[PDB]
Amino acid sequence: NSSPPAVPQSFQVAHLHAPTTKVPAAYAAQGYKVLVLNPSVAATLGFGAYMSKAHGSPITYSTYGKFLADGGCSGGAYDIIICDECHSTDATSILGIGTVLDQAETAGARLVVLATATPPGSVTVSHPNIEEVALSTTGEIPFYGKAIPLEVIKGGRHLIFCHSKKKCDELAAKLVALGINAVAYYRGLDVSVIPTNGDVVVVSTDALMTGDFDSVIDCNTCVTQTVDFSLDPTFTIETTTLPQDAVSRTQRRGRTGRGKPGIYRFVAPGERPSGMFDSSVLCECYDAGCAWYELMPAETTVRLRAYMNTPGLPVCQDHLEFWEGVFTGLTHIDAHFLSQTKQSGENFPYLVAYQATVCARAQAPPPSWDQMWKCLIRLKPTLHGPTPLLYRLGAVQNEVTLTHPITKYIMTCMSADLEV
Amino acid sequence: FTDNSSPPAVPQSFQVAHLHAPTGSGKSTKVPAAYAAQGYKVLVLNPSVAATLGFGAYMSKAHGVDPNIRTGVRTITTGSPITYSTYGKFLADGGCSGGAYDIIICDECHSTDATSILGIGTVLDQAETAGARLVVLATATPPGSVTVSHPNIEEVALSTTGEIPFYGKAIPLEVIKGGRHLIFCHSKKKCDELAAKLVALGINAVAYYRGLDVSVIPDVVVVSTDALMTTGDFDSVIDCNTCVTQTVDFSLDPTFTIETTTLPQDAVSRTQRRGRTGRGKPGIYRFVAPGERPSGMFDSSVLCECYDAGCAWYELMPAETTVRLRAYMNTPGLPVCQDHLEFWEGVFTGLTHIDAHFLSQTKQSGENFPYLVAYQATVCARAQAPPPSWDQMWKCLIRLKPTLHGPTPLLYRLGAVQNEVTLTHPITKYIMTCMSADLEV
Ligand SMILES: C#Cc1cccc(Cn2cc(CC(=O)O)c3ccccc32)c1
Ligand SMILES: [Ca+2]
Ligand SMILES: [Ca+2]
């Protein structure tokens, strides 16, 4: 829907399909208490005040993460809850939105607005300020099957997106050897980008989020987390390289043509339509419900079910029964290990710590000694033998045994809860 | 590349045009007729054999125009300026033969079966050289499309309250007897669980999947997969909203696996299942899930199939297939996939000296990857080793008795593997090297 919903007389959930702050102000004029939720409340530009800044109330600005950590809706705090950027498919956004949908009516809200500039099926649209030119096979620098001519990046400031750190390092090196002032950027860095202007080409992943560029060169692919039901013995959380989607393409292209005209150069003309996410995100939600939010798996199900019963939101395979059953069987986790995996910012702190629990309780070693398995560096009492492998969270370098009862439990959940 | 809601005028020099229009608006009939009327010769390409034959028959009856009809099974030549062909038959004919057509309409250009992708890629690569003035990429559902409401169809979410356990939800008995009803499941099997557990009921209901053809009453409830094509009166449709699709897994055990996966349905699927009601008589649509994948992506396994058919049916060197597929991928406004052209070209280029007779058989069998099947069977026979299983797939080896000594030299996984295997065959190692060479991160 193109325009802001009128407040209904009984509770309803509406959609606001915006174009690319004013809408909350309106409801607040009508005397309504408004909660706005975003992934983050830092300024969109990356520069500016926080959205939560006072004197700029009947309008509260928070995040899905804080909302979840606060425990959801309070029993009568708001009339209207705005779930902004409701296309976001990170775990926190999905669980937080699911929670709003499940709780808002009971907490006495009259309206939930699911707002986004990018609803399901959206595609990138032409930008008036940005000329788009396909890469050809001609040029000195090989780039994902096409080529970059040295001329279009010699002099000026340019941004090149690659899908991985390695390709970034690799590409930067070839440019440096041809005289280009090339800086590689990825997570684990900052500052190395020459701000003074002066010629540069930044070769980056999507870690970058401030200065401005004459052109953007896009590989048009991105790395994503996926779950594989691989039966070796159970499932695997891994990464796939996929074609980018419309938000990614729009976001990357958007680093140029701010003010002055810009150029966007691409490897592929197309994108994935926005609007699906992977079952591994569901797994993340249950993990986070158990590790962070003191949510029983069934309480997590209720919130996620509310999500999936709601039309116009990103879609995913219905694996709630499966994942709820998996985490239900993961009992007697070692509390110390969980603290440690939480503390270190592991992706699946509950799963990592639970695998650790099973290792230590059977005095067996981790699937590896990658720093994921850090909490177990009691390496010598442990070292003895095959790993009781529950599931694959990374590459395995130890000998394994597939016979632990938890392993059989998960396999049984797989055969029973996953559709044929 | 130009975007159109109506038939683009024939330009003076070559042009690729996109036609996004309701498919009742005679994309396949009114549009080529209007071009013919202007003096052009027009080729109309469709994925379906039945559709191609059906446009010919509609033009004859409704307009007394007898088009040329070209399909695998059946070829008719009247000399009409209108030709209807399947993409597959178009490819068998060598693609664009010089000077034959002024206008080529790639109808249902959203289609992602192999014949459409290789066929459209071939048109985009060859048309201008062959003297065509215009290529029209025609679909009702371009990339990114979502289902829109149907004026004649009321849509009602299924609740969990009901006598009928249906994909985590419930069908209340009251909404399906009497009247005429169609129910979509995703596999053969649960077309039964639903069917059987349905005359503890009252029925007239029966389950169609692949092997049946027509048992349908024209008071009923039909429970079927997608194989029932778009017949006979329904007051309602009820949709499990999931589908089975083919995918490739780079499983490194030793190489890759062709397998299937259950996914949320996409929009072309939803619209189409829903479409079998509200055909004049207003209909009700009941769904398990309010959501759908937007249309416009396909799996790398379809690329594999293109190269496979290129070698098996169309005598295309893998490098030739690549050129056609590259033209598809370089063209804006089409379904996208992972860029695995180098990898699959590489794979098939290494597969030499296939047993011609094994290939003949897998082709006549209608197996899915006749080339890959016949090739695995080729290396089995030459190593005197048995097939990966004794599935119907491997029946060209059905004079087994000498070729059983030990392990299967496994090149790739096309199904379940029941025999013991070895992983050291040079062709296996070759594929493994191509994986390192051409697949990312
Ligand atoms: C790409 C591709 C591909 C995939 C499967 C089967 C086929 C074979 N195939 C299909 C058709 C379509 C048809 O039967 O008309 C065809 C026509 C002539 C020769 C071969 C034909 C091609
Ligand atoms: Ca798999
Ligand atoms: Ca796998």
Q: How far apart are CA A36 and CA A43, in angstroms?
A: 14
Query: Are B44 and B82 within 8 A, CB to CB?
Result: yes
Distance B299 CA to ligand 2 centre (A): 13
Amino acid at B338: Q
Amino acid at A23: V
Residues 6+ apart with CB under 8 A from B182: B221, B222, B224, B228, B234, B236, B237, B238, B276, B277
**Cβ separation A144–B339 shorter than 8 A:** yes
Helix (H) or strand (E) holding B392: none
Angstrom CA distances, B365 to B136, B360, B369, B396, stand at 34, 9, 11, 10
| Other C-beta atoms lying within 10 Å of the C-beta of residue A58 | 16
Give the Cβ contact number of residue B188 at 10 Å: 17
DSSP B156-170: EE--S-SSEEETTEE
**Strand A141-143 to A146-148 pairing:** antiparallel
How far is residue B139's CA from residue B116's CA, in Å, rounded to a whole number? 12
B249 contact A CB<8A: yes
Specify whether the CB–CB gap between A101 and A70 falls below 8 A. Answer: no
Phi, psi values for residue A223, rounded to 5°: -95, 135
CATH of B142-242+264-295, one of 3.90.580.10, 3.50.50.60, 3.40.190.80, 3.40.50.300: 3.40.50.300
Which of B73, B90, B91 has most ligand 1 atoms within 8 Å of its beta carbon, as the pocket-test mutant? Answer: B91
Residue A64 corresponds to which tokens in the numbers above?
Answer: 């899905």
> What is the distance of C-alpha B195 from the center of its chain?
27
Residues belonging to the binding site of A are 228, 238
Report the C-alpha gap between B300 and B258 in whole angstroms. Answer: 10
- The strand pairing partners of B221, in sequence order, are B181, B205
Class of domain B7-141: alpha beta
Which atom of ligand 1 sits closest to the CA of residue B70?
A: 15
User: Is there a contact between B286 and B313 (Cβ–Cβ < 8 Å)?
Assistant: no
CB within 8 Å of B306: residues ≥ 6 apart: B114, B117, B118, B321, B325, B344
CATH class given for the domain over B244-263+296-432: mainly alpha
CATH superfamily of A119-221+243-274: P-loop containing nucleotide triphosphate hydrolases (3.40.50.300)
Are A182 and A158 in contact by the 8 Å Cβ rule? The answer is: no
From CA A363, how far away is CA A378, in angstroms rounded?
A: 10
How many CB atoms are closer than 10 A to CB A85? 19
Could you give phi then psi for residue B49, rounded to 5 degrees?
Answer: -60, -50
Q: What is the DSSP letter of A51?
A: T
Please report, for chain B, the start and end positions of each structural domain, with discontinuous segments joined by +.
7-141, 142-242+264-295, 244-263+296-432
Query: Which residues contact residue A6 at a Cβ distance below 8 angstroms, ignoring those fewer than 6 apart?
Result: none
Q: Sort out which chain B residues have CB atoms less than 8 A from A145's CB and list them.
A: 339, 341-342
Burial class (CB in 10 A: 0-12, 13-18, 19+), B187: middle
B290 touches chain A (CB under 8 A): yes
Return phi, psi of residue B312, to 5°.
-85, -40
| Distance between Cα B415 and ligand 1 center (Å) | 22
| Contact assignment for B289 to A144 by CB distance below 8 Å | no
Burial letters for A153-183: b for 16+ Cβ neighbours within 10 Å, e otherwise? beeebbbbbbbbbebbeebbebbeeeebebb
Given a contact cutoff of 8 angstroms between Cβ atoms, the answer to whether A142 and A40 are in contact is no
CA distance B75 to B90: 11
Which runs of consecutive H residues, i.e. helices, occur in B161-286?
Answer: 190-196, 267-274
Q: How far apart are CA B27 and CA B19, in angstroms?
A: 9
Positions of E strands within B47-94: 68-70, 75-76, 82-86
Nearest residue to A37 via CA among A118, A106, A117, A92: A92
A241 to B440: CB separation less than 8 angstroms, yes or no: yes
Rounded distance, CA B271 to CA A350, Å? 41
- Residue carrying the six token digits 């649509």: B285
Taking the Cβ of residue B336 and every Cβ of chain A, the question of whether any pair is shorter than 8 Å is answered with: yes
Tell me if B339 and A163 make a contact (CB, 8 A cut-off). Answer: no
The answer to whether residue A249 neighbours chain B at the CB level (below 8 Å) is no
Ligand 1-lining residues (CB < 6 angstroms): B 49, 71-72, 86, 88-89, 92, 114-115, 118, 305-306, 309, 313
State whether A230 and B251 contact (CB < 8 Å). yes
B64: exposed, middle or buried (Cβ count in 10 Å: 0-12, 13-18, 19+): exposed
Which position has the token pair 């049946």?
A: B212
Facing residue for A121 by CB, picked from B145, B329, B333: B145
Superfamily of chain region A223-242+275-411: RNA Helicase Chain A , domain 3 (1.10.820.10)
Q: Is A239 on the interface with B (CB under 8 A)?
A: yes
What is the CB neighbour count within 10 angstroms for residue A60?
16
- Residue minimizing CA distance to atom 13 of ligand 1: B72
Tell me how far the alpha carbon of residue B170 lies from the centroid of ligand 2, in angstroms.
30
Method by which this entry was solved: X-ray
CATH topology of domain A4-118: Rossmann fold (3.40.50)
For residue A81, what are the β-bridge partners? A35, A112
B378 Cβ contact partners less than 8 Å away, ≥ 6 residues apart: B353, B354, B355, B358
**DSSP label of B201:** T
Prior bond to A233 cis, omega within 30?
yes
Determine the distance separating the centroid of ligand 1 and the alpha carbon of B49, expressed in angstroms.
Answer: 10
Which of 250-289 (B) contact A at CB < 8 A? Answer: 251, 262-264, 267, 289
CA–CA separation, B324 vs B329, rounded Å? 9
Buried b (16+ CB within 10 A) or exposed e, B17-43: bbbbbeeeebbbbebbbebbeeebbbb
DSSP string, A286-319: HHHHHHTS---HHHHHHHHHHHHTSTTS-B----
- Written as one string, the DSSP assignment of A85-142 is TTT--SHHHHHHHHHHHHHTTTTT-SEEEEEESS-TT------TTEEEEE--S-SSEE
Domains B7-141 and B142-242+264-295 share a fold: yes
Cα A400 from chain centroid (whole Å): 31
Round to whole Å and give the CA distance between A409 and B48: 46
User: Does residue B259 have a known ligand-binding role?
Assistant: yes
Contact yes or no for B143 and A164 at CB 8 A: no
DSSP assignment of B211-229 equals S--------EEEEE-TTS-
Let me know if B15 is exposed, middle or buried by CB neighbors in 10 A (0-12, 13-18, 19+): middle
Distance from CA of B201 to the nearest CA of A (A): 25
Q: Is the peptide bond before B39 cis (omega within 30 degrees of 0)?
A: no
Q: What is the DSSP letter of B391?
A: S
